[PDB]
Amino acid sequence: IQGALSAYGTATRILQEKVQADVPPEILNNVGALHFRLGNLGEAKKYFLASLDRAKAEAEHDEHYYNAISVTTSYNLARLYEAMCEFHEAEKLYKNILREHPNYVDCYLRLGAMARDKGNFYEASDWFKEALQINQDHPDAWSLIGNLHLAKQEWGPGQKKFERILKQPSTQSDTYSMLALGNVWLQTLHQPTRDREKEKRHQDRALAIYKQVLRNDAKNLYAANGIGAVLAHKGYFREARDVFAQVREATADISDVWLNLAHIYVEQKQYISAVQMYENCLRKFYKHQNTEVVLYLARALFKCGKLQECKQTLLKARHVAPSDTVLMFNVALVLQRLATSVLKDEKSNLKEVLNAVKELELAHRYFSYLSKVGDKMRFDLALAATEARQCSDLLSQAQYHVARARKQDEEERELRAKQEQEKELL
Amino acid sequence: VDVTRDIVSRERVWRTRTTILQSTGKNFSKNIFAILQSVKARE
Amino acid sequence: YGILFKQEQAHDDAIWSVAWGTNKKENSETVVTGSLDDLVKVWKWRDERLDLQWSLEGHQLGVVSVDISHTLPIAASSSLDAHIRLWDLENGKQIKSIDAGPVDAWTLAFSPDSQYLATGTHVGKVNIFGVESGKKEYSLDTRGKFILSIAYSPDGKYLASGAIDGIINIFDIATGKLLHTLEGHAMPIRSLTFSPDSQLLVTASDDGYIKIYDVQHANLAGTLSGHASWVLNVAFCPDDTHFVSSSSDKSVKVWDVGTRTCVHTFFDHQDQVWGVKYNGNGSKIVSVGDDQEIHIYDCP
Amino acid sequence: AGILFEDIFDVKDIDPEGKKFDRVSRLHCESESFKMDLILDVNIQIYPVDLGDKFRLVIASTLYEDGTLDDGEYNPTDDRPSRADQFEYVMYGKVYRIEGDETSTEAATRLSAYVSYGGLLMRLQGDANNLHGFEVDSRVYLLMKKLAF
């Protein structure tokens, strides 16, 4: 994208030596279009404003249609304004195209996206279906429809119909829809009914989908993306790194690989290679504290940098939305892990015995509060009884060791006195 | 109207959905289906 | 329009809120913050410099909310340990510890009369504890999901609450009854505050639009496009001419409350800012966040 | 195995102080996932690298996959399948130093393994967890390969 820019810089000045002729809007619009994708958003904005001002001047260029040139420049300009933290100006510019040419699709599709930020039930779900009735042969507008049903996955099995609408041969082949099928089929995994010869068939079906979109497209990465997911679901983590390696190497800047790769690493007791992979996904400017990552972050952590620090990330996660039950359960499981790691074999510092009981008390208060909640993590939390029994015998061991604390107190007091007397000799 | 064919005929779409699926590079399936087939024979 | 003071490494852990005074009751010169490292530092902004005055401890979990009483030089601190401990900036001692068990403890809300303290409950209600009592005086019966933000008005005439699904609940602190319920958002409302005149009500949702509604008739006064990330903290200038907006994108935009325009933006924070608050006059703008760096923004 | 390290880097600066030699240039890559530095010297004549190139750099302890730990002598006539068959630039060196941000009491967080490839240096300055299999005076391979993405 720098080469077209280098050519446009010189083509802009090479059109001034023959005569005093202003630059046509058609060159400024594309040079600003290149800079729109770049970080020169303000500069592309000046390019688009000047392309608008120049194309407006074409009062006799009725053959080249200055009007379509101002339309495309304003379209890129509202596309930029939506991206310049300004949806008000993008709405007004996109409505200025709607008021003059309602037979346009992208200006009508880009308006629903702006309201879809506030919620997936506003004029987005309505504008997206209104665009399809005017152009049902628009694969973009029809593929947008299935994206509405992705908010609520309750249309798991029933989405197959609406994804198989434009599966007619006139649209074929379409990798977008065929892979959306494999995705809606993979979402059906992670279920305990695999011994019922039900999920194995699902694996083989999605694998056939992937082999087909592989035979027709060897360079599509998403095809191998699901194949690695199934091979990992088959139990081959040793052989999933190799399939994900080709995907990582091509582009590893997709949010999915940073995670799919990170599960093998947390699988082979390499949290040292898994915790950075999770931070790197969170390097994107979209959130700071996600729940789903931090769920994957604590898996088999037992280490001193992996228990107390894991609480800090857990609190960072519950800080954004405490309403989840699994955060409130794991914060208790880690609290019990830490308290049993100071009140069983330790024989450790004295202040920590005072602090461990406070943590154990808080964990026990959470044990009672969790048990009254109705809904759970698709798994009833009736098994808190073993945790309560562990905290009981933990209370007994803490009351046994708090006396060791005082014994070590007398030990250190007599050590300091038997040292002070040696110093008095000198 | 003519405003549709006035714009769909001069613009340039360098990227679309299916572009996003393939790598920009050259990663055929000879190195993919090989392991994909090796995993099925061991089972 | 810039930054005056730059406090590097203001904490061991990330700061989640910041409180500063606006009255003359030994509140505007001291800076009370609460971070996740369980250090309630009492910073004394003396000699135009951010000095530590007190270092209060005791919270099991990181501090979630810090605010200065309006008519009083004392303070308090909430966390997720269901133990809301009151403090004093006059001695650096602890007044009391409201055990808001078992977990139902959220951001604080000093009354302007400094007599009540609102705290969210997980059941959806808004428990109004008493400052000198500690007991649950009266609780608003507006159930739902959870209260994500509670605020008192500077003159004490209305009260709002941010839910998890973008539901403003305009209460009446003068009778204790739900009057309006503003649902102009579907995003979890992070925080909100009241205008110095109790006429406008800003809402900091997770859609990056600053939809400033009204309270007198419960209506929207205009959609302001905020940041691209989620507006975390939002405060009004004491002289009521502008209002700042903390997002989760290392971005300190200062929007206008009259024209709805960014009048200045700060990008000195390497991380996302978490707390923003004005001074007593509105020139110094203190700011905290995960950078653990307290910046003092002057806009004369 | 024997993979002491593995990552994707990309050339961010090529010989910056000026070119000191003619067949050798400093690459100042940065990593992509673990966020490591690299200062590498490559034979810029038989394996030319230009800016903005990305390569996968696998620092290995042996070349045979089973990790059977060869001696350190050169024998070209060898059937055994190696890791060098899927890379393009393989070097063989000797880690000569491991600096760190140790303090007197607590441990170090950032390490720097300096290895030297027959004269052509390298410094993998990262954090103290990815630099684990590296101990000073031990033989190590390089194995890099350019990603055509």
PDB file of C-alpha atoms in Angstrom, chain A residues 37 64-65 68 71 101 103 139-140 143 174-176 207 211 214-215 217-222 227 234 236 242 246, chain B residues 1-4 6-7 10 12 14-15 17 20-23 25-29 31-33 35-36 39-40 43:
ATOM      1  CA  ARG A  37      -6.624   1.984   5.861  1.00  0.00           C
ATOM      2  CA  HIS A  64     -17.817  11.173 -16.068  1.00  0.00           C
ATOM      3  CA  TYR A  65     -20.563  11.599 -13.464  1.00  0.00           C
ATOM      4  CA  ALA A  68     -20.958   9.124  -8.332  1.00  0.00           C
ATOM      5  CA  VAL A  71     -20.936   9.513  -3.623  1.00  0.00           C
ATOM      6  CA  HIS A 101     -30.105   6.982  -3.671  1.00  0.00           C
ATOM      7  CA  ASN A 103     -30.896   1.701  -4.243  1.00  0.00           C
ATOM      8  CA  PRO A 139     -24.102 -12.606  -0.576  1.00  0.00           C
ATOM      9  CA  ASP A 140     -22.905  -9.836   1.752  1.00  0.00           C
ATOM     10  CA  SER A 143     -24.370 -13.549   5.048  1.00  0.00           C
ATOM     11  CA  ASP A 174     -19.095 -19.857  -1.436  1.00  0.00           C
ATOM     12  CA  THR A 175     -16.478 -20.624   1.189  1.00  0.00           C
ATOM     13  CA  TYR A 176     -18.017 -18.121   3.601  1.00  0.00           C
ATOM     14  CA  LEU A 207     -14.204 -33.022   8.924  1.00  0.00           C
ATOM     15  CA  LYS A 211     -11.899 -31.716   3.526  1.00  0.00           C
ATOM     16  CA  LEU A 214      -9.670 -27.995   1.515  1.00  0.00           C
ATOM     17  CA  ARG A 215      -9.799 -29.755  -1.841  1.00  0.00           C
ATOM     18  CA  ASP A 217      -9.060 -24.217  -1.474  1.00  0.00           C
ATOM     19  CA  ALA A 218      -5.689 -25.312  -0.131  1.00  0.00           C
ATOM     20  CA  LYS A 219      -4.719 -21.779   0.910  1.00  0.00           C
ATOM     21  CA  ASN A 220      -7.795 -21.064   3.034  1.00  0.00           C
ATOM     22  CA  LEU A 221      -6.687 -20.966   6.645  1.00  0.00           C
ATOM     23  CA  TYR A 222     -10.099 -21.383   8.240  1.00  0.00           C
ATOM     24  CA  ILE A 227      -9.420 -29.473  11.475  1.00  0.00           C
ATOM     25  CA  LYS A 234      -9.973 -36.435  19.169  1.00  0.00           C
ATOM     26  CA  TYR A 236      -4.182 -35.433  19.587  1.00  0.00           C
ATOM     27  CA  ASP A 242       1.709 -29.255  13.650  1.00  0.00           C
ATOM     28  CA  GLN A 246       0.871 -23.739   9.259  1.00  0.00           C
TER      29      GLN A 246
ATOM     30  CA  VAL B   1     -31.634   3.935 -11.504  1.00  0.00           C
ATOM     31  CA  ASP B   2     -28.347   4.615 -13.290  1.00  0.00           C
ATOM     32  CA  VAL B   3     -26.583   5.638 -10.076  1.00  0.00           C
ATOM     33  CA  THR B   4     -26.072   1.925  -9.368  1.00  0.00           C
ATOM     34  CA  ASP B   6     -22.520   4.398 -12.533  1.00  0.00           C
ATOM     35  CA  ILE B   7     -20.583   3.260  -9.448  1.00  0.00           C
ATOM     36  CA  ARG B  10     -15.718   2.104 -11.971  1.00  0.00           C
ATOM     37  CA  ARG B  12     -12.328  -1.401  -7.280  1.00  0.00           C
ATOM     38  CA  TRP B  14      -9.378  -5.433  -3.785  1.00  0.00           C
ATOM     39  CA  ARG B  15     -10.616  -7.288  -0.690  1.00  0.00           C
ATOM     40  CA  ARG B  17     -14.911 -12.048   2.323  1.00  0.00           C
ATOM     41  CA  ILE B  20      -9.915 -13.143   4.030  1.00  0.00           C
ATOM     42  CA  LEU B  21     -10.012 -16.925   4.130  1.00  0.00           C
ATOM     43  CA  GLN B  22      -6.951 -17.713   2.045  1.00  0.00           C
ATOM     44  CA  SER B  23      -3.506 -16.742   3.166  1.00  0.00           C
ATOM     45  CA  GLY B  25       0.922 -16.677   0.637  1.00  0.00           C
ATOM     46  CA  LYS B  26       1.217 -20.143  -0.845  1.00  0.00           C
ATOM     47  CA  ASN B  27       0.288 -22.855   1.657  1.00  0.00           C
ATOM     48  CA  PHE B  28      -1.044 -25.804  -0.278  1.00  0.00           C
ATOM     49  CA  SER B  29      -2.554 -28.910   1.286  1.00  0.00           C
ATOM     50  CA  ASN B  31       1.722 -30.531   3.755  1.00  0.00           C
ATOM     51  CA  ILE B  32      -1.740 -30.642   5.374  1.00  0.00           C
ATOM     52  CA  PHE B  33      -3.585 -33.634   3.982  1.00  0.00           C
ATOM     53  CA  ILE B  35      -0.750 -35.567   8.312  1.00  0.00           C
ATOM     54  CA  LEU B  36      -4.531 -35.519   7.957  1.00  0.00           C
ATOM     55  CA  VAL B  39      -3.847 -39.666  11.561  1.00  0.00           C
ATOM     56  CA  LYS B  40      -6.644 -41.827  10.148  1.00  0.00           C
ATOM     57  CA  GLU B  43      -6.655 -45.282  14.439  1.00  0.00           C
TER      58      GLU B  43
END
